[PDB]
Amino acid sequence: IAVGMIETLGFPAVVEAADSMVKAARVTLVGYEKIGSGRVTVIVRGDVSEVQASVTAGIENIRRVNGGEVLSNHIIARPHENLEYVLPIL
Amino acid sequence: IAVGMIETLGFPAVVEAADSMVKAARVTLVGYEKIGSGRVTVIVRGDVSEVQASVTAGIENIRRVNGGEVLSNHIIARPHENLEYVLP
Amino acid sequence: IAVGMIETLGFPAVVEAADSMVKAARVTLVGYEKIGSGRVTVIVRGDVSEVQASVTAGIENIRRVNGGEVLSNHIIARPHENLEYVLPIL
Amino acid sequence: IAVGMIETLGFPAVVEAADSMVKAARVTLVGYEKIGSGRVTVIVRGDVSEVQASVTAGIENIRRVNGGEVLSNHIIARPHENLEYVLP
Amino acid sequence: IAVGMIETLGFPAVVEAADSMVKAARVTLVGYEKIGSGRVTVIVRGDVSEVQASVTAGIENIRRVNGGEVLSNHIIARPHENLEYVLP
Amino acid sequence: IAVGMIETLGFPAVVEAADSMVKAARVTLVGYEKIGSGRVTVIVRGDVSEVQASVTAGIENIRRVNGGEVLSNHIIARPHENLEYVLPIL
C-alpha cells in the first residue's frame, strides 16, 4: 500500500493539505512530521491511485491558504517493509 | 462547525491572535502549535460564521502588537472526522 | 489581571527583561517561552498599570545588555479565560 | 560491513532516500536522525559494496522528488565498535 | 551576589566560555541553556566582582576557539528572588 | 582528563568525525550535542595528547564526506570539575 506526503512551510497549510487529501480519496491519514525551519509533513496510506488523487488535491488547495507554501511532495507506490518501523509513516 | 487558525512570527502576537479570536465570536480556543523557526499557530472551533468573525478580528488586532507579524491564516468549514490526528 | 510580555533575540537579554520587569512593579513573573530562531519571551501578570510599568522598564534595560535585541512586546489588560489553559501565560 | 547515510533538506526526500537505499542492495535501514534546520538523515548497514550500491541509488532517485534536495552523503567502511553512541 | 552569562554561536565556544569563567574567579557554573538557532548560553553565580572577572575572561578566551563566536554577554548585580523561574 | 570536540554543519559529517576520532587514539566517545541550525558536536575524553591526535584526524577526514563542513572545534586539557555535571561532556 502506497504512501503519499506533502511538505509545507507553515502549519495552517499542512492542515488544509491533510484535509483535502483525506476528503479527495480512500486514504488513511497517518499523522504529520515536524523537522524544523517551519517544515512540516502530512502522510497518508492507501491504493496508489487514491494516494495520487489525494496528493494532487492537497497541493491544489494550499492555494486557498493565505500565506501557504508547499516545499516538497512525493509518493512511493511499493514502500519497503523496513521503512514502516524506522520512519513515522505508519 | 469550522476550524480557524492564525500563524504568527513571534509568541506575543500569537497571544493577541488567540485573545482577539475568542473575544470576537463564539469559538473555543482548542490549540497552540509550534513548528520551529519562530512560527507559532493558534487554533479555534465553532460555527463557520463565528470562526470567520474571529479570524478577521485576530488579523486586525495583531497590527497593534509592537513587533507583531501574521505569517498565514486559514479556515476549514467542515473539517474531516480524522483531522484530529494533526490538531493539538 | 493583565498579562505583559517581552520577546528577545537571545537569552541573556530575556533574563534582564525578566529582572527589570519584576523589580519595577507589583507583577508575578510567570515563566518564559521559547519558539525557535533564537526567539524567547518572558511573561508577567498583575494590575494593568503595574504591567505597563514593568514592560517599559524591561524594554529600556536591554539597552544595558551587550548584543541584546527586543523583537516584540505586548500587553493585554483583560485576557480571556480560555487563554489561561491553552497558552503558557499562567 | 559498512554504514551508509544520506542527508536531505525536507522529509519526503529522506523517505525516498531510505526506500531507494533499502531496495537497491542488501542493507538494513537502522536509523533516522533529525538535527533541526530541516536537516534529516537516513542510515543503513551492510556489506561495503551493498552500502555503496544503495547510497548511489538514493542520491539518483531523490532527483525524482518534487522539491527534493540532498545536503550530504557518506559511507564508513569498518565503523568503530563504539560508534553506536552517535547512531540512533 | 550577581549572575553572569555568555551566549555563543556554537557549542565548543560555549564550553570554553564556561571553563574560562569558572577558572577565572569565584563563581559557580549553574546553567546551560539552548534556545535553538545554534544559540547557547552559559550561566554563573557569585560576587559581582568575581562575576565581572569571569565574564571578561570568557569573552577573551573564545577568540582562541577555532570557529568561536560570542553573540551576547550580560551581568545582573542583584538578581530578583523570583528570577529563578527563567534560569535552568 | 582532556575533552575534545568537533562541530559540524550536517549529521553524516559528525559521524565521520566521531569515527575517525575514536580510531585515531585512546579516547572514549562520550556522545554528541545538537544545538539547532544544523549544528552538531561530537565529544571525547582521554589523555590530552590522544585527544589532539583524535581531533586532528577528525577534522581531516570530513574532507572525505560529500557536502561536509566543520564549523568549529576545540580542546580543553584540564576541564573544571563543575562542567562535568552542567554540560553533556561526561
PDB file of C-alpha atoms in Angstrom, chain E:
ATOM      1  CA  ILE E   1      25.958  38.289  44.537  1.00  0.00           C
ATOM      2  CA  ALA E   2      25.384  38.536  40.744  1.00  0.00           C
ATOM      3  CA  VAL E   3      24.611  36.360  37.680  1.00  0.00           C
ATOM      4  CA  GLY E   4      26.842  36.186  34.617  1.00  0.00           C
ATOM      5  CA  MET E   5      26.075  34.796  31.193  1.00  0.00           C
ATOM      6  CA  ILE E   6      27.754  34.439  27.861  1.00  0.00           C
ATOM      7  CA  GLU E   7      25.886  33.412  24.766  1.00  0.00           C
ATOM      8  CA  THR E   8      27.670  31.919  21.755  1.00  0.00           C
ATOM      9  CA  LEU E   9      27.067  30.640  18.287  1.00  0.00           C
ATOM     10  CA  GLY E  10      28.307  27.024  18.526  1.00  0.00           C
ATOM     11  CA  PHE E  11      28.669  24.569  21.378  1.00  0.00           C
ATOM     12  CA  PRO E  12      32.511  24.240  21.600  1.00  0.00           C
ATOM     13  CA  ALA E  13      32.869  28.002  22.260  1.00  0.00           C
ATOM     14  CA  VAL E  14      30.245  27.824  24.987  1.00  0.00           C
ATOM     15  CA  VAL E  15      32.359  25.161  26.734  1.00  0.00           C
ATOM     16  CA  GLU E  16      35.333  27.404  26.603  1.00  0.00           C
ATOM     17  CA  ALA E  17      33.139  30.274  27.917  1.00  0.00           C
ATOM     18  CA  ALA E  18      32.157  28.081  30.814  1.00  0.00           C
ATOM     19  CA  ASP E  19      35.657  26.737  31.512  1.00  0.00           C
ATOM     20  CA  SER E  20      37.263  30.178  31.500  1.00  0.00           C
ATOM     21  CA  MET E  21      34.558  31.767  33.634  1.00  0.00           C
ATOM     22  CA  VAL E  22      34.789  29.209  36.387  1.00  0.00           C
ATOM     23  CA  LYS E  23      38.644  29.193  36.374  1.00  0.00           C
ATOM     24  CA  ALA E  24      38.954  32.997  36.330  1.00  0.00           C
ATOM     25  CA  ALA E  25      37.102  33.827  39.560  1.00  0.00           C
ATOM     26  CA  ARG E  26      34.934  32.636  42.465  1.00  0.00           C
ATOM     27  CA  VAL E  27      31.745  31.816  40.587  1.00  0.00           C
ATOM     28  CA  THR E  28      29.646  28.673  40.248  1.00  0.00           C
ATOM     29  CA  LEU E  29      28.544  27.306  36.884  1.00  0.00           C
ATOM     30  CA  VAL E  30      24.816  26.890  37.464  1.00  0.00           C
ATOM     31  CA  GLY E  31      23.303  26.965  33.957  1.00  0.00           C
ATOM     32  CA  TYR E  32      23.405  25.814  30.348  1.00  0.00           C
ATOM     33  CA  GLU E  33      20.513  26.999  28.095  1.00  0.00           C
ATOM     34  CA  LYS E  34      19.667  26.240  24.446  1.00  0.00           C
ATOM     35  CA  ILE E  35      17.128  28.419  22.537  1.00  0.00           C
ATOM     36  CA  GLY E  36      17.733  26.970  19.042  1.00  0.00           C
ATOM     37  CA  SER E  37      19.253  28.647  16.006  1.00  0.00           C
ATOM     38  CA  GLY E  38      22.635  27.412  17.299  1.00  0.00           C
ATOM     39  CA  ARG E  39      22.398  29.886  20.216  1.00  0.00           C
ATOM     40  CA  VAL E  40      23.727  28.535  23.543  1.00  0.00           C
ATOM     41  CA  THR E  41      24.107  30.296  26.924  1.00  0.00           C
ATOM     42  CA  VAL E  42      26.254  29.566  29.981  1.00  0.00           C
ATOM     43  CA  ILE E  43      25.281  31.000  33.392  1.00  0.00           C
ATOM     44  CA  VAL E  44      27.278  31.643  36.630  1.00  0.00           C
ATOM     45  CA  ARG E  45      26.684  32.960  40.168  1.00  0.00           C
ATOM     46  CA  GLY E  46      28.953  34.710  42.668  1.00  0.00           C
ATOM     47  CA  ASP E  47      30.071  38.123  43.905  1.00  0.00           C
ATOM     48  CA  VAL E  48      29.644  40.919  41.364  1.00  0.00           C
ATOM     49  CA  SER E  49      33.438  41.462  41.091  1.00  0.00           C
ATOM     50  CA  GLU E  50      34.111  37.723  40.665  1.00  0.00           C
ATOM     51  CA  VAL E  51      31.323  37.590  38.054  1.00  0.00           C
ATOM     52  CA  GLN E  52      32.805  40.690  36.317  1.00  0.00           C
ATOM     53  CA  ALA E  53      36.248  38.984  36.218  1.00  0.00           C
ATOM     54  CA  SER E  54      34.799  35.668  34.892  1.00  0.00           C
ATOM     55  CA  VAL E  55      32.662  37.094  32.056  1.00  0.00           C
ATOM     56  CA  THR E  56      35.649  39.205  30.882  1.00  0.00           C
ATOM     57  CA  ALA E  57      37.909  36.118  30.827  1.00  0.00           C
ATOM     58  CA  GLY E  58      35.231  34.168  28.932  1.00  0.00           C
ATOM     59  CA  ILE E  59      34.868  36.787  26.190  1.00  0.00           C
ATOM     60  CA  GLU E  60      38.657  36.947  25.683  1.00  0.00           C
ATOM     61  CA  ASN E  61      39.290  33.198  25.576  1.00  0.00           C
ATOM     62  CA  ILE E  62      36.569  32.408  22.993  1.00  0.00           C
ATOM     63  CA  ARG E  63      38.865  34.166  20.500  1.00  0.00           C
ATOM     64  CA  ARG E  64      41.044  31.048  20.958  1.00  0.00           C
ATOM     65  CA  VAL E  65      38.349  28.650  19.707  1.00  0.00           C
ATOM     66  CA  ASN E  66      38.556  27.769  16.053  1.00  0.00           C
ATOM     67  CA  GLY E  67      35.114  28.853  14.818  1.00  0.00           C
ATOM     68  CA  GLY E  68      34.206  30.568  18.077  1.00  0.00           C
ATOM     69  CA  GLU E  69      31.719  33.454  18.179  1.00  0.00           C
ATOM     70  CA  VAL E  70      30.229  35.462  21.073  1.00  0.00           C
ATOM     71  CA  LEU E  71      26.638  36.633  20.411  1.00  0.00           C
ATOM     72  CA  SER E  72      25.844  38.395  23.691  1.00  0.00           C
ATOM     73  CA  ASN E  73      27.071  38.829  27.277  1.00  0.00           C
ATOM     74  CA  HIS E  74      25.420  40.286  30.404  1.00  0.00           C
ATOM     75  CA  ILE E  75      25.714  40.591  34.196  1.00  0.00           C
ATOM     76  CA  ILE E  76      22.920  41.269  36.705  1.00  0.00           C
ATOM     77  CA  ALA E  77      24.191  42.530  40.060  1.00  0.00           C
ATOM     78  CA  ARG E  78      21.321  41.890  42.488  1.00  0.00           C
ATOM     79  CA  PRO E  79      19.089  39.416  40.645  1.00  0.00           C
ATOM     80  CA  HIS E  80      15.487  39.274  41.880  1.00  0.00           C
ATOM     81  CA  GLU E  81      14.362  36.449  44.220  1.00  0.00           C
ATOM     82  CA  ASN E  82      11.989  35.099  41.582  1.00  0.00           C
ATOM     83  CA  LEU E  83      14.337  35.302  38.600  1.00  0.00           C
ATOM     84  CA  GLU E  84      14.907  31.541  39.148  1.00  0.00           C
ATOM     85  CA  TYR E  85      11.779  30.880  37.013  1.00  0.00           C
ATOM     86  CA  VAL E  86      13.817  31.714  33.888  1.00  0.00           C
ATOM     87  CA  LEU E  87      17.177  30.195  34.963  1.00  0.00           C
ATOM     88  CA  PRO E  88      17.898  26.470  34.398  1.00  0.00           C
TER      89      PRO E  88
END
